[PDB]
């Protein structure tokens, strides 16, 4: 199978520097072009540029001409993209995608995209606060963390159904998000519920059992 | 540059419905269009190329077509699989320009919401902070209004909303509100007051507890 392989998450300073990459296999790598796609949360795809691996050449959009440089290496079926004085503007997921081979070149297979964030702000756990009050809805509230993401899971996933865990909003440089879990009256709190929240970023896991006042 | 136009931004509709997706060309691209699918938290998917040759896999139901400025995608009796968003793409020549998307959403009969209101946890109280959270559950449509009262009167700062994308399994939505105040200035009331406005009602759902009870 053709697959893309693309480096983890980033947390970078405003301007300063990134540089990504995406391992390339199951084809020809100097067959096919290159191409580097940006997308902001919860919004558009926006084109960047592509690489020939075979001859080395670029194209570029205009716009992120002198904000990307993208370059390949042969022998290791990898692309990479760096973008340099890096600004908020910038923090966006960032997918390499490989380009169709026809006739005319279409975009068929994408990475599972690298995400940058660019802040000044630093790397901090989240405080993990229990929320008490024929069903009951408890709930679980993730503050002041950074970066994203973090994963909520109510009883390690054997709890899956009557769960919302909502976006998380910067609350002063820092995040904030929310957990609701609605289980039958009866079975709580005889049956104890707890949520489980990791921030990789941080290495942290948490685990909050959720006691009755 | 060369400028895409895609239409609508949203779309809603119901399954078994039929809807069309527009794109516009600033410039003759002859027929060197695409189209792609992307879920929330997924890479995109090509559908289409060459403005009306479905990819491999693709269900018969999408079809595309146009020539030179002019393309739409059709999407014939939608399936729940459908929902998700829509993107075009200018594909053999620079720049391979993608229209803004299309989000495309289910349709469902309104619903209230199943408001909970949860008082600060002691443990973030021995933190200094105090948070009151409010969950308004599974609702249709999205358009909300949440009010927060302490000792009767409304206040707004220091309330953080967020809302969930449709669900997957009833395709409702789902708010979460947060007041956050100091331990000080909670302590110093005691009705704490969630008052949630929707087109479900003319009164306003309340929720509330008192802090000495």
């Known amino acids: 199978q053709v697959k893309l392989l693309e480096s983890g998450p980033e947390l970078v300073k405003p301007g300063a520097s990134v540089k990504m990459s995406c391992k390339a296999s199951?084809?020809?790598?100097?067959?096919?072009?290159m191409h580097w796609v940006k997308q902001k949360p919860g919004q558009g795809l926006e084109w960047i540029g592509y690489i020939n691996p075979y001859n080395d050449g670029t194209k570029y959009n205009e716009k992120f001409k002198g904000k990307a440089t993208l370059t390949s290496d042969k022998s290791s079926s990898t692309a990479y993209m760096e973008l340099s004085s890096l600004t908020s503007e910038d923090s966006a997921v960032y997918y390499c995608?490989?380009?169709?081979?026809?006739?005319?070149?279409?975009?068929?297979?994408w990475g599972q995209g690298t995400s940058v964030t660019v802040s000044s702000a630093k790397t901090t756990p989240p405080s993990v606060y229990p929320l008490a009050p024929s069903m009951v809805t408890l709930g679980c509230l993730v503050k002041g963390y950074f970066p994203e993401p973090v994963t909520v899971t109510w009883n390690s996933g054997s709890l899956s159904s009557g769960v919302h865990t909502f976006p998380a909003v910067l609350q002063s440089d820092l995040y904030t998000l929310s957990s609701s879990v609605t289980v039958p009256s009866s079975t709580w709190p005889s049956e104890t519920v707890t949520c489980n929240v990791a921030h990789p970023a941080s290495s942290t896991k948490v685990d909050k059992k959720i006691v009755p006042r | 540059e060369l400028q895409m136009t895609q239409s609508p931004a949203s779309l809603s509709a119901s399954v078994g419905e039929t809807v069309t997706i527009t794109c516009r060309a600033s410039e003759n691209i002859y027929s060197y269009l695409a189209w792609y699918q992307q879920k929330q938290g997924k890479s995109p998917q090509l559908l289409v190329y060459?403005?009306?040759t479905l990819a491999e896999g693709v269900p018969s139901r999408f079809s595309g077509s146009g020539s030179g400025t002019q393309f739409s995608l059709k999407i014939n009796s939608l399936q729940p699989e459908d929902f998700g968003s829509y993107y075009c793409?200018?594909?053999?020549?620079?720049?391979?320009?993608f229209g803004a998307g299309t989000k495309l959403e289910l349709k469902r009969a309104d619903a209230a919401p199943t408001v909970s209101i949860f008082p600060p946890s002691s443990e973030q109280l021995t933190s200094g902070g105090a948070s009151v959270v409010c969950f308004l559950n599974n609702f249709y449509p999205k358009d909300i209004n949440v009010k927060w009262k302490i000792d009767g009167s409304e206040r707004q700062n220091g309330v953080l909303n967020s809302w969930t994308d449709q669900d997957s399994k009833d395709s409702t939505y789902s708010m979460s509100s947060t007041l956050t105040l100091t331990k000080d200035e909670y302590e110093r009331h005691n009705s704490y007051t969630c008052e949630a406005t929707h087109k479900t009602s003319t009164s306003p759902i309340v929720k509330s507890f008192n802090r000495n009870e």
């Open positions: 995608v490989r380009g169709g081979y026809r006739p005319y070149y279409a975009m068929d297979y």
């Open positions: 199951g084809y020809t790598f100097t067959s096919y072009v």
């Open positions: 060459n403005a009306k």
């Open positions: 793409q200018h594909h053999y020549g620079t720049p391979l320009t």
